[PDB]
C-alpha cells in the first residue's frame, strides 16, 4: 500500500537528471588507484598530476558514454529496451576499433 | 618611429604579427607569404566569433552571465557544422546532449 | 617569473566586439585556447602538405585559401573565404 | 609500507551503480546484469591503450612523472581530442 | 565514367579525367560499399534477421559516425 | 530509354553483386534506392576535395594524384597508384 | 678518397642515402641526425621485409611466382597487428579475405 | 627523355631475394609497395615532427624515431623493429 512507482519511472527521472548535469560519475578515488595499478605494469611508479587523472578520465567517461550512445541504439533496432553483451560487442565493430 | 601592430593595420583582434611567426616556426613551408599569415588571422577570428556567439547565445538561454564549459558544449553539438568540424573531440565537462528516444519514454 | 604564453587576451576582446555583457570562467578559456590551437595545427597541416604535392616551397594566401575550402563545410567554408578576402584586401591597402 | 603498493582488487572499485549511472548519461531503461564484467574489461582495454602511449612520451622527455600535457597529445593520436588541458 | 563526369560537372565546366584517375574513384568506391555492406550485414544478422533491410545502413553509418 | 539520372547506370544486378562480396545471403527491395544515395554523397565528397586540389594547380584535368589525396583526408588512403 | 655508400656501412638495404636528402626537403625539424636516416631505414626493411614475406608465403599456397596485388591483402589481413596498421588502408585490386557468417550456411 | 623519377623499384626488388630468392613482381604490384612504404615513412616522420616540436628541439635523431615507431607499430612489431634499428646504428657508428 506504499506509493510506489512502475518499474522504469525512476530510471526516466535518472536519465533527464544525469543529462542535465555534467559532473564526472565515477568516484575519484576508486578511478585514482586504479590508473596507478595500470601505468606501473609498465614503468617505476610514475607520478601522476592531479590535473592528468581528471583529463585521463574526461576523455575515457566521454569515449564510455559515447559507446553507449551507439549501443542502445543498436539494442532498439534488435527490438529490445534492454541492453546485452552481444550489443556491446557489435557497437564497436561497426566502430572499428576492434578491428 | 610610429609603430604599429599589424593586427591594427588589417583592424583584426588576432596575432597578425605572432601569426606569422608560428608559421615559420612550425617547419611548414620554407617560404611564407606576406599576405599568408593575414588571410589566416581572420580564419580563426571569423571562426572563433561564430562558436562564441553560439556559446554566448546559449549563454543567455540558461539565465547565466558566464559562459561555463556546458555552454561549449552547446554551441559546438547543436549546430551540426560546426559538429561535423568537431566529431572527433570531447569537451571536459562538457556532459551529453539532453535527448531520450521514444521507445526509452513511458508507454503512454 | 615563469613567462609562458596564451591566447585569453584575444578571445576575450573578440567575446566584448559581440556580447559585451558576458564573462568567461577559466575552464572555458582554455578550450578556446586549445581550439584555436588545433585549428591552427590542422589548417597549417593541409596547407604544408600543398605546397610540397605542388613543388611550391612557399605557403601564401592561396594555399590556405584552399586549405580552407577542404578543411570547412560550404557554409563556414564561403563566409571565411569572403572574411579571409576581405582580410587582405585591407591589409593589401597599406601593407 | 614505506614504498611500493601491491595492485589488486582495482577493477572492483568500478562499483555496480557507478555502471549504472555511466550508461544513465548515455540514456537506457534496462542494463543486464551480465554488462557490469564486461564494461569494466572495455574500460581496462580503452585505458591501458591510451596511457602505454602516454608514458612514451614521458619515456622520451626522461622525465619520470606524467602530466596531462602527454595525455592530451596520446588522445591526439588515437582520433580522440578532449580540449581543457592547455593542449 | 559517365556518372562521375556528369557529378563532377555540377562543381566545374570543361573537366577532364585521366583514365587512370577514373578508375581510382570505382577502387576506392567498392572498397567502401563492400566494407558498409558487411558491417550492414552483422546488424541484420543481429535482428535474427537473414535478409538486409534499408534501416540497417543508417544504423551502420551512424555508428560510424560520419552521417548522423 | 533516354538518358536520364546516371546512378541508375548502376544496375540491379550490379549493386547485388558487391553485397554478395561482403557475405550477404538476401537483399531487400528497398535497398536498392539506399545505396545509390551512400554512394552518391560518398563519391560526392571526395570529388569536391579532388577538384579543388586541381583548382589549386590551376590543371583542368583532374589527376590520379589528386584522388588519391582527396581519399587520405577522408582516412580512406589508398595505394597502388603513386605518392 | 674512395666513394662507398653508406648503405653498406650500416650493413642494410634500404637507402640511408636517400633518405638523408630526402628527409632534409621533408619539413620536418631545423637538423636531422647523422643517424636519423640509419635508424630509420632499417624500419622500412623490417616493414618490407614481413609484408613481402607474407606475400611471397601467400603465393606459393596460389601456386603462382608472381606476387599478384591481390596477395598482399590475402597475406595483410590474417596477421593482425599487420592488419591493424593498415586497418582504415584500401589497396586498389585488393579483394576480400574467404569468410561467410555462420548463421548464414545451410542449417544441415 | 624526361622528368626523372624516384621509386623504390630495385630497392623492394633486390630485398625480396632474401625470402624468395626466385619469385618476381608484378609491375603493379612495385606501385604498391611504392605507395605503402611512402605512406608509412610519411607517417613515423610525421610523429618524429611533433615530438621534436613538443620538446622545443631542432633536430631529430635516434631517440625520438626510437620512440616514434614504438607508438605507430602495434605489438611485437616495435620490438623487432627497435632490434633493427638498434643493430642498424651500431654497424654505422662502429665504421664512422
Partial sequence: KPHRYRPGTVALREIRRYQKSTELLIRKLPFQRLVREIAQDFKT????????????????????????????????????????????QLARRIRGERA | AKAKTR?????????????????????????????????????????????????????????????????????????????????????????????????????? | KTRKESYAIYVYKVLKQVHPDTGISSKAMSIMNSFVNDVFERIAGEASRLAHYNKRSTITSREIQTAVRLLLPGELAKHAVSEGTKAVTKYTSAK | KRHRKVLRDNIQGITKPAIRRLARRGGVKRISGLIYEETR???????????????????????????????????????????????
Avoid: W
Fill in chain 1, 45 to 88: 611508479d610514475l607520478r601522476f598530476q592531479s590535473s592528468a587523472v581528471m583529463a585521463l578520465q574526461e576523455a575515457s567517461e566521454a569515449y564510455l558514454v559515447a559507446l553507449f550512445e551507439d549501443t542502445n541504439l543498436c539494442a532498439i533496432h534488435a527490438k529490445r529496451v534492454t541492453i546485452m553483451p552481444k550489443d556491446i
Fill in chain 4, 41 to 87: 574489461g572495455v574500460l581496462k582495454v580503452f585505458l591501458e591503450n591510451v596511457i602505454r602511449d602516454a608514458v612514451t612520451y614521458t619515456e622520451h622527455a626522461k622525465r619520470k612523472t606524467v602530466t596531462a600535457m602527454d595525455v592530451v597529445y596520446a588522445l591526439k593520436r588515437q582520433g580522440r581530442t578532449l580540449y581543457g588541458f592547455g593542449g
Fill in chain 2, 7 to 108: 593586427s591594427s593595420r588589417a583592424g583584426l583582434q588576432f596575432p597578425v604579427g605572432r601569426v606569422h611567426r608560428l608559421l615559420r616556426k612550425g617547419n611548414y613551408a620554407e617560404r611564407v607569404g606576406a599576405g599568408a599569415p593575414v588571410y589566416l588571422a581572420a580564419v580563426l577570428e571569423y571562426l572563433t566569433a561564430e562558436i562564441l556567439e553560439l556559446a554566448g547565445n546559449a549563454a543567455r538561454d540558461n539565465k547565466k552571465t558566464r559562459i561555463i564549459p556546458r555552454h561549449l558544449q552547446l554551441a559546438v553539438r547543436n549546430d551540426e557544422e560546426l559538429n561535423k568540424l568537431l566529431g572527433r573531440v570531447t569537451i571536459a565537462q562538457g556532459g551529453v546532449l539532453p535527448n531520450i528516444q521514444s521507445v526509452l519514454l513511458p508507454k503512454c
